[PDB]
Amino acid sequence: HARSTGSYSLVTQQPLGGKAQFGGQRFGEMEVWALEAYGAAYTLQEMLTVKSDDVNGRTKMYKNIVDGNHQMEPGMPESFNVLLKEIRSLGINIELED
Amino acid sequence: RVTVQDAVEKIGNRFDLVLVAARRARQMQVGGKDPLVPEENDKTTVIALREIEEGLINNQILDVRERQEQQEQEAAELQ
Amino acid sequence: EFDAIKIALASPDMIRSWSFGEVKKPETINYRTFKPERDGLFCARIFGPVKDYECLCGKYKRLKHRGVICEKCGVEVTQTKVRRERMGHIELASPTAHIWFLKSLPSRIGLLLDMPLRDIERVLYFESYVVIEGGMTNLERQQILTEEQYLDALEEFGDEFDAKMGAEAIQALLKSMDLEQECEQLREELNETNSETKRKKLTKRIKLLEAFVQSGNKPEWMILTVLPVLPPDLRPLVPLDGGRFATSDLNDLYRRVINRNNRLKRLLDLAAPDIIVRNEKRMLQEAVDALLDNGRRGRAITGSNKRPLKSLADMIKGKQGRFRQNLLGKRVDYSGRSVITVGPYLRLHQCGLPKKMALELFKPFIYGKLELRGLATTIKAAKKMVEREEAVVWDILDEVIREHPVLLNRAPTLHRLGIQAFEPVLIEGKAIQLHPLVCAAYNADFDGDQMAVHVPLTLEAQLEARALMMSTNNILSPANGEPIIVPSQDVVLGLYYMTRDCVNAKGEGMVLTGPKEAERLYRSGLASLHARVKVRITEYEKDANGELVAKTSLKDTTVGRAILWMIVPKGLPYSIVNQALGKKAISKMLNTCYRILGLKPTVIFADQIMYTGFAYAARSGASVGIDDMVIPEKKHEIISEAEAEVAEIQEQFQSGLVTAGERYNKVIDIWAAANDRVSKAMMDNLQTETVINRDGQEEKQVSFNSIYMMADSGARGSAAQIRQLAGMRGLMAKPDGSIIETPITANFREGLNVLQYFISTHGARKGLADTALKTANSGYLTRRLVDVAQDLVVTEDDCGTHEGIMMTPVIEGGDVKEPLRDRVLGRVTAEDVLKPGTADILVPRNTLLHEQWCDLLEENSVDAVKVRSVVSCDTDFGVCAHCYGRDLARGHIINKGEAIGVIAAQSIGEPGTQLTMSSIQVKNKGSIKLSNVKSVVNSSGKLVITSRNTELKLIDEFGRTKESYKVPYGAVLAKGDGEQVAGGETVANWDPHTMPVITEVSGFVRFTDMIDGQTITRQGLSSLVVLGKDLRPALKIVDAQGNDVLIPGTDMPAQYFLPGKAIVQLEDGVQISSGDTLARIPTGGLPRVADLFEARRPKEPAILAEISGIVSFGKETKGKRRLVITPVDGSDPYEEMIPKWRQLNVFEGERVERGDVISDGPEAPHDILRLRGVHAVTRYIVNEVQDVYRLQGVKINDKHIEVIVRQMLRKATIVNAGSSDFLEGEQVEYSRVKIANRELEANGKVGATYSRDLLGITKASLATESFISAASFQETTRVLTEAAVAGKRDELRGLKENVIVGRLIPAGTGYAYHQDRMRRR
DNA sequence: CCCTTTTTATTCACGGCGAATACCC
DNA sequence: GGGTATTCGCCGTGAAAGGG
RNA sequence: CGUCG
RNA sequence: CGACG
Ligand SMILES: [Mg+2]
Ligand SMILES: [Zn+2]
Ligand SMILES: [Zn+2]
């Protein structure tokens, strides 16, 4: 089973999983630890921000691959925004400082 | 080649050579630069890593080349 | 964008300003229309509609009308992205309390107010009242009154008695209580310090009040007044088709909360009595309990079909939460998964990829190539050309899968070699071809295993996969300096069959001119493969600098070795080829080729070795059969004599001569001896079974059996499996702990019955359950071990330290286990090494120990080298490049910016699955050495000991130490100081049942205060047992003159107190001497690794001496036992107790010393750190972990344990505060104290005294400066409650904090980018 | 879309932390 | 007048559905 | 790691 | 959310 581009979930902006549904493979925490054992800065930056999150960034990355540019953008992960809206639903305030 | 060993002997950090090779291969693809070595059905990463090993492309060499290009751009915009 | 995350409490005005409207209707779905309702959880005027730029009525269809409001209900035009950020709020007519500030363990409200938790539960559940605004009242302000006390409490006091019930009373108690005067009175109460538990509780309350004062939050915000909701896009409700409707549980909980709030609002408008509004407030309290976090109480609600609903906190914590399944681990694109295949025609830097997977995973690259080549009109034409299976885009794939590496990955990942990079080729099939040389690092056999493949997109990701994650660059192990590319079973068998010695073959006794003639004679068939011939070889050496010399010689070798010499390059001599070439010989050859030539000729040499082995494995033709597993003809005789001996000892047991407890040991001993004899006969029959004649008489050589060739070369299978296969397998033990006395007689070649197959299945099921549980235990252990040292990056190159550890090979009592070369390899020493012979300087201070200084270190025969470690560093927030040393992956030093803690945790957690879940004499010759013992001469000419911490060493004739022993107190010595001993001679002899009471002086003994009936009992045997209550006896001695014998130097007289439960055989009035005792008194494995790393307290710990001084008995076990250790010039406010189970080892008339063991058993890891030192607990835990690892046979370097040890003691406490702002009872970081005292000790101010304390892998990971890495490790609610109360400000510094926010981790390029960002800022 | 009454009562290993009774000077 | 050793519980990880 | 509802 | 390898 292989997937380049497919559908995504509605509760979070992540690809699906399995063979009957068009989904990709799961990059677990041990793979993140094995990448952190190497340098893998831009490898980990493109693994969990460009391929899964950044719904406006992955389209720009696809257009850059189509036009012939191997350059990406950091963007903003949508799962962190979901977590920020989830903790704010309780009686705990959390925001980002500049 | 098949391995990256002599680039460690040239630059003994193995982190800045990747960045300067990406900076060399990016300007040869987006902007467009003349390759200093003859290519034989190779991509820009292998061309940049081959230009690293000979010594024509380095960190300070690329910095002074960018500075000379910016000085030529300001001299062209001045006239 | 942002650089810090600030967390605080939620003000109700902030929740009112966050939302845009108020909800009133509880209904969400009307089940008739597709549009949502105008008010509810799925609102349209608050959160927005679903369609982009379209209202509910259908009047706005143009984008130019954006900027107005709707007149029907108030639904403005929105997008699909802005609907996820709009929220709503719910007002509360009745106040309620929070759950995270109620059961935080300890409670925040219970710590802020002077009230236990049960009274707070009684007030919050409407069980009892609290008096508010008493004023001039004899009753206490926090007094609890029952239901019958309210009547006379209202009708007794003359003033107005107003007492609130519920959360309003708690809110009034919070509003009426101030903060500055309360903390002022608490600081005025600090000077009492009556009890130490009240002292630490009071300082904890002062720290909580100060954390409330310095923060910008209020204590009144714990009472919930305005409650925010989640957006409807975060809670998707897909309309299913069936008899029942599918919905989320959180929406049902919110609907129940809105229903209870609307019922309370309808109840307040009818002037209801107190009990019904009390029950309504209780139902609203249960509703807000079920909404926020359910399951913490005794009654967890169940929605449908007996299933507890997931609240807002249940979907965050745990394994299936958002931190572990949506932030650290995400689904990725451009990925595949197939079945692995061998594919022996590939190289090391390449793998095999199918055409369908390469066409699917590279669709946008093919599209971009078709756009740049000018072949397709648009992207849709290229898509139609791709999905129609044309023969036009096939040669375009040869240009994009040429120099583009992919990331191969196995589903279990233990270390960094589980993810490697290969250049994929296009093969035909549906499977991935994984190279056999990397299978030892992947630990993947081809019995249906699956692997994942990833495709990098960024140019920097491709360059990092090529330059760092390549398979040709990672050939060494991360735990030790050994090559991971080794021939496993087939290549080593081919190289063993090709290079072997024979006594007679075809073409023996002929001389050849070169290796090409030998290969031609082997391919032509005129000469055999294994024959002793003579060839002319030219070997190249590199003894000169700049050139390689050559030498021509003729050596007697084999034809197969002459063929293999063409594989061997010029950098290696002929001594590595002419050997037996087993399993370790090829690894030593590859290590020599890597250490002499380098990385470039080694990756071709290993591939050529694998190609030659795979080529000669087909030419060998090794097969197994019945005649290969031979049977010894003398086995049945040994079995017959063994059965006769068991029958004779059974007859002797049944006659009544030998008891069964020794007969069982005799039976199992003679069966083990018979098994060893059968195994020795089988090995002698296997290794010598073929005889080949040369001229006349015959000769005996090593046999050419296939199973013996597979067992001797180390190809596949150890010697124990061959012993269980050919010979008898031995005794099979019971799983409960015992072992059956009868073994398995028949082997696997012969037939078996059902009795010889039951205990083997018992042991196999026990081993299978053991490994199935211990692999999950090891996974949990390495998951705990990664998060301890996940934020240690090398930021400096040289710092300069004067302290260090004393690196020395440890001696357990027998021979050596770890030599000097494998302990100090690649580590910078601390100071100069002192020479015992001439006393000069060998090494400088800051120098690296390469492979040449270790030869001088072992030739000088040094004892201990002061080497800098990871714990004794001084770099702030990380270590330097000199305190670590070699990274065990490259020949040079470690570069700056490498996260070595994750590599250390991965190298520790990887072989954790292999872990299972009377007299002192010498052995060799040499001199002895006594330490910490005073020698007292005896009357017979021997020497007696008096100290308890004595230790004996063995010094050789050169000056080194090769043997050490530990003798307890009360043992005579046989050899003297400076006397050479021999092998097989006893030194110390003692009894482990009787403790000595023998003094060092002589004299006529005399009993004192021994009355029969009160303290002694006389009851053949002429002795009395020692058990007027508080009157202790004494043992005085009389000399020949008649006066008192006083010991010069010590003020204690010559008397001894008799201990309890001890017999005294000798009476008084006789001359005594030294040597006669007067009074005669009678888990390793992975849980051990978890106990050592978790720093848990033992079951029965030992008590260590705090200060040196004489001892004094306070009590004699009436209810307790108290001992006093008083010094000479000081007092002692320390009184310890005895748990009435530990044997008292310390006496009153012996030498005292701080640091002595008084109880047999394991010692606590906290007492050795605070009393002995800081470099003593570290070496002890490193040696214990290394002993547990060497019990199995794995090899892990000492730095990986030392970095975890350094991360363990990172926290510290303050003893004396002084002029600093920190208190004397708080636990802060050591780095903050180190950067705060540097400006205080250099100036005229005073500093604070600190003392390091040891923490486990769980307590030190959860207690840190950040609140994100501590919330995703084990728990979430407690650290979020602490971060909300204290108001911590997080800074993205470590590695785990950048994975959550999604940016660059501090790698080497990450350290470069972080230094550039710090330079720009 | 809303009240009520007769009883659904369902089983780990190991460790950290908080709280009600006590003997002795 | 007053306090910590011992013990015992709670928590951390791997009572509400039926008809009109 | 997958399959099913 | 449960069963199976
Ligand atoms: Mg397998
Ligand atoms: Zn409208
Ligand atoms: Zn240092």
Side-chain angles (χ1 to χ4, degrees), chain C residues 873-926:
Chain C
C873 186
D874 214 1
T875 318
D876 283 288
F877 303 98
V879 304
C880 66
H882 278 56
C883 281
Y884 185 73
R886 194 176 181 177
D887 59 330
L888 310 170
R890 289 97 192 179
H892 55 82
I893 208 166
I894 181 62
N895 304 120
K896 177 179 61 181
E898 187 78 22
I900 46 181
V902 193
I903 318 170
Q906 282 186 328
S907 47
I908 284 181
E910 182 256 348
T913 316
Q914 305 180 7
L915 311 179
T916 78
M917 179 182 178
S918 63
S919 174
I920 299 300
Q921 55 265 2
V922 304
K923 197 249 180 181
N924 54 4
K925 54 182 177 299

Side-chain angles (χ1 to χ4, degrees), chain C residues 145-171:
Chain C
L145 59 92
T146 46
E147 199 72 29
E148 57 96 18
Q149 299 189 207
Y150 197 84
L151 185 153
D152 55 353
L154 181 60
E155 299 189 13
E156 215 278 332
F157 301 140
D159 55 354
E160 179 68 17
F161 188 79
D162 187 354
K164 296 180 179 60
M165 172 63 85
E168 298 188 10
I170 313 295
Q171 189 179 4

Side-chain angles (χ1 to χ4, degrees), chain C residues 1124-1143:
Chain C
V1124 189
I1125 309 108
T1126 171
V1128 177
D1129 58 345
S1131 44
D1132 45 347
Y1134 183 75
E1135 303 290 332
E1136 76 265 15
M1137 301 303 179
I1138 303 299
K1140 314 301 177 300
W1141 273 325
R1142 303 163 187 171
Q1143 185 258 353

Side-chain angles (χ1 to χ4, degrees), chain C residues 398-517:
Chain C
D398 303 348
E399 305 172 356
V400 295
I401 319 294
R402 191 182 188 272
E403 297 288 331
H404 187 275
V406 295
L407 264 68
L408 259 64
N409 174 46
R410 203 175 174 255
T413 302
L414 301 179
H415 52 282
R416 49 193 286 182
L417 305 178
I419 308 178
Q420 296 184 7
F422 302 93
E423 294 181 357
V425 306
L426 271 81
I427 71 175
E428 199 76 273
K430 291 180 180 180
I432 309 177
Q433 288 180 345
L434 179 72
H435 202 244
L437 283 183
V438 306
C439 287
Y442 270 82
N443 203 22
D445 47 357
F446 300 98
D447 54 356
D449 292 4
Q450 304 179 17
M451 270 184 43
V453 58
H454 300 276
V455 175
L457 305 175
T458 323
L459 210 72
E460 283 85 12
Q462 296 171 21
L463 275 178
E464 280 177 348
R466 182 174 299 273
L468 304 180
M469 305 178 50
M470 212 61 175
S471 75
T472 56
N473 304 334
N474 306 328
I475 73 166
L476 299 184
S477 199
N480 53 3
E482 321 283 350
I484 206 66
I485 308 299
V486 286
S488 279
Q489 39 185 333
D490 204 8
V491 189
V492 55
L493 180 61
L495 291 186
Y496 183 75
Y497 190 81
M498 191 179 59
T499 65
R500 216 190 188 191
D501 187 20
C502 203
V503 285
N504 187 25
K506 184 176 181 180
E508 185 193 12
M510 51 188 304
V511 57
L512 308 181
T513 75
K516 298 182 179 181
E517 191 168 333

